[PDB]
Design an enzyme around this catalytic site. Structure first.
Site, PDB file in Angstrom:
ATOM      1  N   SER A 219       0.808  -1.216   0.000  1.00 32.47           N
ATOM      2  CA  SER A 219       0.000   0.000   0.000  1.00 32.47           C
ATOM      3  C   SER A 219       0.856   1.288   0.000  1.00 32.47           C
ATOM      4  O   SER A 219       1.460   1.586  -1.019  1.00 32.47           O
ATOM      5  CB  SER A 219      -1.021  -0.035   1.133  1.00 32.47           C
ATOM      6  N   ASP A 242       0.041  -4.201  -3.972  1.00 33.83           N
ATOM      7  CA  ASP A 242      -1.071  -3.253  -4.072  1.00 33.83           C
ATOM      8  C   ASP A 242      -0.638  -1.819  -3.743  1.00 33.83           C
ATOM      9  O   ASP A 242      -1.264  -1.167  -2.916  1.00 33.83           O
ATOM     10  CB  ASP A 242      -2.295  -3.712  -3.232  1.00 33.83           C
ATOM     11  N   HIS A 297      -7.820  -5.095  -1.110  1.00 32.34           N
ATOM     12  CA  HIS A 297      -6.630  -4.410  -0.614  1.00 32.34           C
ATOM     13  C   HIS A 297      -5.958  -5.098   0.579  1.00 32.34           C
ATOM     14  O   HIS A 297      -4.724  -5.304   0.565  1.00 32.34           O
ATOM     15  CB  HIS A 297      -6.937  -2.941  -0.299  1.00 32.34           C
TER      16      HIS A 297
END
Ligand code: 6HZ
Ligand code: CA
Ligand code: CL
EC number: 3.1.1.47
Length: 371
Positions: A219, A242, A297
């Site tokens: 992330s 991600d 996610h």
């Protein structure tokens, strides 16, 4: 349960803080271990993490104590303070966590990498992107365990562009500093851990394969990978899980010589983000992208295993895909990628088709249509 490692080795876990200040390194270490009979590792080890998590989820100080009640005794399948497995030089991964996370929350990745023969330094960021972190004001506070807590910073819409870039840049420096700390320990430098723990750091002397270093993150940690690689040529490849590309300055995208792998979820991604990933592509550079089908996610974070299927789906922690299935694909593709680009002489090449997204739960590249 967070899943056990799929590789041959037993896994240990310890924490390292050096120095004790807000500017020192804080990391959680996963490593191949000699023995498999220690107590499992406490997943979220302090109550102030739960408080920082409630604030991040936008709830009362009271809800934090409810999360502490439901999850405060949860462990991860890593031998707390086990002796490091001797007689081999291990390649090193530095791991960067997402926004609202902290060092302990990617143990399914950290435990699996270690079972295959990696040392994993999952760093805790002091950029106020973690839910909570701590340090000591000085040497005296350090000694008597007087912790100073740093909580997540909430931004105004105005502050977004500037502050997220400051943070991705601090994150990168914290990844470099964590690498330098491990290398010093390897090169025999005696470091006094600011945390009193029954793990001798001397064990790590001559334990690192000094040329085989990668940076992995999820992330915000995905952008940390990219920023890191552009600043530090010591990192020989990166894997952005991600990646949230927004923190990155326009200047980085043309300045990454290292092999770089994007493993994306199906449901997180969006045009603006994919376009920013595409800004990193070039014919002279190694670039690879997969999308895990049916995934979300948080499929990369331990939260994916923390609950059952129905509560998990509702809270967006589980996707249509089984979590062990999705993490196996991510971990295994990672293993093959790291073998290719660090020059490892293991069996991880058995998973080369995963890098290309040749699997029924994999998409080559992205599902996201752009221009
Ligand atoms: C499942 C869980 C266990 C213990 C503490 C928090 C959580 C949790 C986690 C997220 C989440 O997706 N987060 C990503 C980053 C920080 C929290 C969302 C909701 C909950 C209840
Ligand atoms: Ca540098
Ligand atoms: Cl999502």
């Amino acid at each position: 349960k967070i899943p056990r490692g799929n590789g041959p080795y037993s896994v240990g876990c310890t924490d390292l803080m050096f120095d004790h200040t807000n500017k020192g390194t804080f990391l959680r270490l996963y490593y191949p271990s000699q023995d498999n009979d220690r107590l499992d590792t406490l997943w979220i080890p302090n109550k102030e993490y739960f408080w920082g998590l409630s604030k991040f989820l936008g709830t009362h100080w009271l809800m934090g104590n409810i999360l502490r009640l439901l999850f405060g005794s949860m462990t991860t399948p890593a031998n707390w303070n086990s002796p490091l497995r001797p007689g081999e030089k291990y390649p090193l991964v530095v791991f960067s966590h997402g926004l609202g996370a902290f060092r302990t929350l990617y143990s399914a990745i950290g435990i699996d990498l270690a079972s295959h023969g990696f040392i994993v330094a999952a760093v805790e960021h002091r950029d106020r992107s973690a839910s909570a972190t701590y340090y000591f004001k000085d040497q005296s506070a350090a000694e008597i365990g007087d912790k100073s807590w740093l909580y997540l910073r909430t931004l105004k819409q105005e502050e977004e562009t500037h502050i997220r870039n400051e943070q991705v840049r601090q994150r990168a420096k914290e990844c470099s500093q964590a690498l330098s700390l491990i290398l010093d320990i390897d090169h025999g430098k005696p470091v006094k851990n600011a945390l009193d723990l029954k793990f001798d750091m001397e064990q790590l002397k001559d334990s690192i394969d000094r040329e085989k270093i990668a940076v992995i993150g999820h992330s915000f940690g995905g952008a940390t990978v990219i920023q890191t690689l552009s600043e530090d040529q010591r990192f020989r490849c990166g894997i952005a899980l991600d990646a949230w590309m927004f923190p990155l300055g326009d200047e980085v995208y043309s300045r990454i010589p290292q092999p770089l792998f994007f493993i994306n979820s199906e449901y997180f991604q969006y045009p603006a983000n994919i376009i920013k990933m595409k800004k990193c592509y070039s014919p002279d550079k190694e670039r690879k992208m997969i999308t895990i089908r049916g995934s979300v996610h948080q499929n990369f974070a331990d939260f994916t295993f923390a609950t059952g299927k129905i509560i998990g789906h509702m809270l967006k922690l589980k996707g249509d895909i089984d979590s062990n299935v999705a993490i196996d694909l991510s971990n295994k593709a990672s293993l093959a990628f790291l073998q290719k680009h660090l020059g490892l002489h293991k069996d991880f090449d058995q998973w080369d088709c995963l890098i290309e997204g040749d699997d029924e739960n994999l998409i080559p590249g992205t599902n996201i249509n752009t221009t």
